[PDB]
């Protein structure tokens, strides 16, 4: 799902990335790493994103 990639970038657009996570998050934002359902759900929990945020389509 390319939507998870775009939503991840959107979330951090007005923030800064934690150094410990900067590497792993950047692989997801650039398409290098796989971006599955469970990973998206865990990422939302880690940062407190609204449930399902990464799978929400754009208008």
């Amino acid at each position, epitope marked *: 799902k390319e939507i998870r990639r775009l939503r991840l970038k959107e979330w951090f657009k007005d923030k800064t990335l934690p150094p410990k996570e900067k590497s792993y998050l950047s692989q997801l934002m650039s398409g290098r790493a796989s971006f599955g359902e469970k990973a998206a759900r865990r990422i939302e929990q*880690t*940062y*407190g*994103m609204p449930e399902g945020y990464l799978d929400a389509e754009y208008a």
Partner: nanobody
Amino acid sequence: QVQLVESGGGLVQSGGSLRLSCAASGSIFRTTGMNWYRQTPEKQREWVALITSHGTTSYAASVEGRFTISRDSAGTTVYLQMNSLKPEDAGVYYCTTRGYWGQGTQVTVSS
């Protein structure tokens, strides 16, 4: 549904210190990350800091080194330690998680 209570704001002199707190229902902060925002005169909802579910942190460029975000020993209350306060730091500070937002706490910095 999640309810959030910010506290600890007030009126402090420039160069002074202030520790904000955020309580959140159901011990959610123990397993969930959160963000601090502030609304200032110059444009609303500026991001300030985050702490993740595991305690890793990130700060806005203008508060790096002066601000420290952390959890209490229990893991259920989040603190924003704000040191060396500047006039640009005044505003209403909001804590948020999971799309829920507290009512906010006011910070005013006098010279």
